[model samples]
Target: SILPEEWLPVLEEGEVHFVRIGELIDRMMEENAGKVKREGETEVLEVSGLEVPSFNRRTNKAELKRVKALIRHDYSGKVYTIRLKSGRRIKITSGHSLFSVRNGELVEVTGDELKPGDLVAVPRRLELPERNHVLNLVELLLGTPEEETLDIVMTIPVKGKKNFFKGMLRTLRWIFGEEKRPRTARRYLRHLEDLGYVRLKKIGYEVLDWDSLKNYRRLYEALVENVRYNGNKREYLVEFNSIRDAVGIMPLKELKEWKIGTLNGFRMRKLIEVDESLAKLLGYYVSEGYARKQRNPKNGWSYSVKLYNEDPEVLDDMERLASRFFGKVRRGRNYVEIPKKIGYLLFENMCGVLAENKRIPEFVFTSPKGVRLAFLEGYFIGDGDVHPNKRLRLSTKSELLANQLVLLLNSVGVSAVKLGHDSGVYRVYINEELPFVKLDKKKNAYYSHVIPKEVLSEVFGKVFQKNVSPQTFRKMVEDGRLDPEKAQRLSWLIEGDVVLDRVESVDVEDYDGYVYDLSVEDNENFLVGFGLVYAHN
Candidate 1:
């Protein structure tokens, strides 16, 4: 565990920020050991090791590193919360090491020594693998079943018991209270027979007391399966072959014969396709759409997906896209309303939510580069802006969406991104050109200045050899000592190949709780917090 239980760091491969470090560690521990046993205030588990990708400072790249142990220890000390310009906050102990940029190079600074205006490294990109997730149609449409009964019918072996007579007596003693109530035990066995857990041939006392009855072993197994501990919530999950069977949408047999692209009178694919258009729609929905749910006596539940935009061109695009992907859509005054069928699908993807809670679904991260660009285009069209000078900036109330956009920009090779939060809104300012949205097209609307690496190197080689202040490096461009065009790129060396957000504030708070850390084999660093700021392990 590299962070406190309350903190949510991005799961690099999953690209999700909701998972707590403690939960992940518990899963890892279970993978290694059989289970984690909680006793007193500590959890005990034995594991060989677990490997995770970590950033190696020396190589300036992410590498597969081994974590020797996951420790959760008791601590009672003052903790520091470092808040960066990106609004990313991390809680750490005084002894924890944090990666910071100082005078043109990456440096390790302890949490106590870190202060405001200190630049901290946030990795621009992660070498994440694509996820091939298989969505269960039944679960997607109807949700999970409350519980599932397992059908385990097998012969009971009495070899382990040695004999059935004594074992039966012992089992009866466990369930029937005492021998003083032998008559009650016989009545309870009859109750068990009625419950389908056992089969009784005779209700007489002789047959019950013998402890040597026909198929008593099988009856015992049945009782064990039903009466004894069965399983947890996850064990009860079952999937129906057809959505109709899972839900009372229509006749079950009729649903099986129904043609493809139609399920319970709704048009949709069994599995969602990761394509440019789908991505674009999702992007637009996240920015300008809202999902509505209503209940009525006649209609069990009704859902509607409404997208709003004042521009006719955008409205047209919305109609075209929604009509093509989703079935029929109602065109409102300035909004397009999609049917409940599409709304249900959108809800399934975890999309179609409030503005503050909007997030990039896991599937979006694994999509193709072109599809990703299309998504950006759609989202930019709604909540993005292009400057007359061609810089791109997008504003949103969602911190997660803003952070995700920053990561997305880096994935597309646009490195110079700045995230800021003001007035309860998060804004992502990109210092690069994006061809996603068309600018200067009479719609009332945008990094042509980005310097190449070689040019940046040339400027550094010609300027002061020793590391100097960032302002001094800028002065060289003013004096014609360095190319004005490539002067900005020269700062990359000072910042490394990452977005350096300055520490805005540091608050020393007295926290008496368990602090966590991870020791990487070679990297000695891992990403933490909402912005995924790199920290020395």
Candidate 2:
């Protein structure tokens, strides 16, 4: 196995969330639960549009490659968690291939072959291509449907069919203004209601009356036909026009089943661009922002999003960005607040409402490098500790965020280490001062295909070529003195942009569970761990 049992691969399906790769794998497994093609082997599923950080030998860079497939097998053996300097840990089985430097050259080494003070390789950059991203409006606005079927009778289990049916019958009669229902049926419904298995309550509507819908033509068309029940517009069906046809196909028996509770009280740009401003606002929000739901006597519950920071510049940027992007911002003493409509968009779809639950959403990983850097800058400004000599550090109680922040840092060509200390909080440290202000321009470099410099010079002298000195030969070869094809070929075989971090400690643990590996297209190795270390497929 290439990863620890607890390692979460940076994975995504189509354009969805990159929350937990293992959880999504389990979800796919559960979704394909019953189809067994062999006795103990479950059929593997195709993971289309699944991209992972992989080392492309041809390009000599760590880049995102489409994952071909995911393989799972049962394993009962010892696995080791090799913790490098500053707690860059990789838990993998023995004999798993890892890149390391030896004698001023890069070489493949297995996990068990590593020892203390050994320099391991980590990418200086992850070449993730830039793309235009649009946030989904349906999921953000409506949230997931709680129940697709309004007919509770269809949802009743087979064991309690008669009891639930009798109760449903009486409940329907009471709801439809039929006061003369039989006492026998009424007894069952009242008993069920008393048992807390079901209850009768009036449903209210929360109308979506915001004027922002005009900008989103498709989303506006999706809700245009949802009618108000009366001229005063006090009641609405809360119909989702997009799903009307699907809902119509279902068998309908009663008229009251069509009445749904108040659901649509939101409107925003259906598909907002993942711009730098969005990235910065989201980054600041992830680090210092929080949401609150409080009691209101006039309204049911009030929701608000607030961002706090001691830095006046960060506070000013927060208010400025929130105002420009969201069009409505409320400023407080040292904090900025956004309305619940836009606030819920972040909290519901991308961000976590609580501090320990926060995450770097999926799109940031797939966004352009500039956007990713902007997010990091925003986060660092909010939570970073600028130490003596320009060292950078950030600490969080969130384990997910810590792991993700490391990957995010690596993707943008920065090396970071994540260490857990005191209680349960994880601390991420950056050894060098960051170029959060700008990006400009490490270890014994290894070229996999180049001949030794001394050997090349001696061979050139013996082969009737000019008697080139070793130093001259080295410079000329590095400067692409050879044919362009050969020069590009030699360059592709080298792993140049990498850091050599020494191994701190390695611990062995007994592991007995499911082990997983991924097959990435056109790449022999992929990245793993919080440090984005290279690993063999």
Best-matching candidate per lDDT? 2
Which consecutive 10 residues in model 1 have the weakest lDDT in total?
147-156
Roughly what TM-score does model 2 have, to 2 decimal places? Answer: 0.66
The list of candidate 2 runs beyond 4 A from truth reads 2-4, 11-24, 33-47, 102-105, 144-226, 229-267, 384-389, 416-422, 433-495
Candidate 2: how many backbone clashes?
1
Per-residue C-alpha lDDT of model 2 across residues 1-537, encoded as one tens digit per residue:
744244555556534233343555667667766642333743456667677777765455666678776666566787778877657677877767777754334578888898887767666555665677776543443454433212111111123333333344444444335656555644554443453434534552121322221222222233233332432433333344444433332222222233332243333433467888888888888888898866678755666788898778778999999887666688888899876444544554576877788888778876888898888888877774433233455777787788778777766766534465556777775654466632111112222112344233333333324323334434776676644443333332233445456678998878787666677788767767655567776
Worst 10 residues of 2 by lDDT: 148-157
All candidates: CA RMSD (Å): 13.6, 13.5
Once all C-alphas are superposed, what RMSD does model 1 give against the true structure?
13.6
55-126 in candidate 1: lDDT tens per residue? 666556654566555555466777788887656677787888777654345678888899897767766556
